[PDB]
Amino acid sequence: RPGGDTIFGKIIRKEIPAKIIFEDDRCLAFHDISPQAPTHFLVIPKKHISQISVAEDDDESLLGHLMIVGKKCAADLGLNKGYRMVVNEGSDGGQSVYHVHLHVLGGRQMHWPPG
Amino acid sequence: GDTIFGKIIRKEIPAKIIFEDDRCLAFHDISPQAPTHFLVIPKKHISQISVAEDDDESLLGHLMIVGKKCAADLGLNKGYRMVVNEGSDGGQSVYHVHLHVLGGRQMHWPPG
Numbered sequence: 001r002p003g004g005d006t007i008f009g010k011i012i013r014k015e016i017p018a019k020i021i022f023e024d025d026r027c028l029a030f031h032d033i034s035p036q037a038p039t040h041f042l043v044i045p046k047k048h049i050s051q052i053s054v055a056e057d058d059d060e061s062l063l064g065h066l067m068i069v070g071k072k073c074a075a076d077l078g079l080n081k082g083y084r085m086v087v088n089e090g091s092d093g094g095q096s097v098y099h100v101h102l103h104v105l106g107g108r109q110m111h112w113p114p115g
Numbered sequence: 116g117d118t119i120f121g122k123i124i125r126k127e128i129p130a131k132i133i134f135e136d137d138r139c140l141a142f143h144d145i146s147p148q149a150p151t152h153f154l155v156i157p158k159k160h161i162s163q164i165s166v167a168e169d170d171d172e173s174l175l176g177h178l179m180i181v182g183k184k185c186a187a188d189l190g191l192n193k194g195y196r197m198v199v200n201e202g203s204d205g206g207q208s209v210y211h212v213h214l215h216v217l218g219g220r221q222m223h224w225p226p227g
């Protein structure tokens with residue numbers, strides 16, 4: 001299926017409700033249901049890629065697109081004091097959904113280390 | 116608006132370089148927050164992700180691809196976390212765009 005089998009595939013296909021921020025032919029941005037900051041959203045590819053470790057060389061511009069859409073959405077949402085973008089890989093990185101996704105967090109001071 | 120990362124690109128100060136090509140550089144972070152902690156930066160001086168141009172998408176993606184190939188080469192088979200900080204709330208420490216890659220331990224939630 002277009003978008004894959006994960007929960008994020010179902011969001012892409014409008015089978016499960018989500019609070020969409022932005023959508024184009026390549027990606028979808030929506031608020032996280034378990035926010036860790038005052039603003040916390042995800043940007044995901046519509047093409048299913050399970051995790052960043054298996055991304056193809058030809059997936060470069062798509063991955064870049066996630067970050068451009070992320071920074072544009074942060075702007076549109078009024079994160080003028082800044083934000084943090086996170087991609088997690090595998091067990092050690094902390095991945096509960098195996099569909100590549102960019103976390104964007106802001107509206108408070110983010111601390112170091114980033115987990 | 117030169118930065119310390121500009122000096123690193125120009126080879127004017129030491130850094131432990133992992134990988135270089137014509138448009139980016141990966142090197143170990145001087146202040147590591149995990150057993151493995153490196154940066155991937157563009158050679159082009161983009162001050163912060165918030166000012167990246169549309170035309171830069173491919174380059175930003177390249178940082179992530181380079182980062183994931185370096186992680187594999189450094190033996191990070193249990194996973195890793197990639198981070199880009201923007202602005203004071205993001206805790207951006209150097210005004211030259213950089214991708215952090217951290218692994219070699221469990222990374223926690225929230226991510227700061």
Ligand SMILES: O=C(NCCc1c[nH]c2ccccc12)OC[C@H]1O[C@@H](n2cnc3c2ncn2ccnc32)[C@H](O)[C@@H]1O
Nearest residue numbers: 007017018031032033034088094095096097222223224
């Ligand atoms: O994979 C990850 N890793 C980060 C967290 C983590 C998990 N395991 C770890 C072990 C260690 C450290 C961190 C972690 O995050 C997936 C994200 O998807 C979010 N999410 C899941 N379902 C929906 C949704 N967001 C909107 N939705 C709308 C409708 N349905 C959903 C979820 O809240 C989470 O932040």
